[PDB]
């Protein structure tokens with residue numbers, strides 16, 4: 001997250017760190033949202049590579065022991081059948097990860113509230129992106145969980161010429177684009193928490209940013225719209 005502030009330890013308990021094995025250690029690659037005690041919602045591109053993945057819930061600092069973390073392996077990866085690795089712009093950048101063990105719930109580990117099916121936010125709706133992604137374009141990962149206010153940019157404005165054009169689909173949510181705040185590499189798969197009727201709900205799964213940079217004016221961070229996949233999410237959980 002570029003232009004973010006350090007989130008409070010118990011502000012976003014559904015945020016998880018998706019990590020891969022690298023030698024004798026583990027490295028953060030993406031974010032995710034805990035949706036069931038044994039299920040994590042992330043981006044499909046995050047699991048494109050044939051790496052060994054683990055999920056860390058109750059995580060705040062990646063480099064230090066917070067004394068609140070629970071480490072669990074990934075038992076099954078269910079990517080959306082329509083996902084194409086050669087086309088992130090086509091959408092369907094969503095995947096569900098079944099955890100090997102069911103995580104224990106507390107103030108640092110809670111389930112993410114999902115929006116009702118078909119919910120589209122009005123333009124400039126209040127949202128917050130969270131993650132351990134790069135703090136600057138071509139920078140490094142954040143040590144502590146970062147948050148940034150990213151108001152929504154509706155389909156009409158985001159799919160216009162000066163913005164994203166035909167790249168953005170209606171199955172996506174766009175947020176930010178102020179040139180200071182945005183998602184960045186490593187935030188992918190993570191949540192976009194939006195305030196609807198007093199409650200924060202995970203309306204987006206971080207998908208992509210501009211190739212020219214993360215915090216680029218008129219190039220808001222693009223997320224997979226969670227409300228377009230409620231039936232899919234429920235069908236996967238019910239069959240597995």
Ligand SMILES: O=CCCNCC(=O)O
Pocket residue numbers: 029030045046047184185186187188189206207208209
């Ligand atoms: O697009 C999201 C940030 C980059 N994700 C790369 C990855 O970890 O797969």
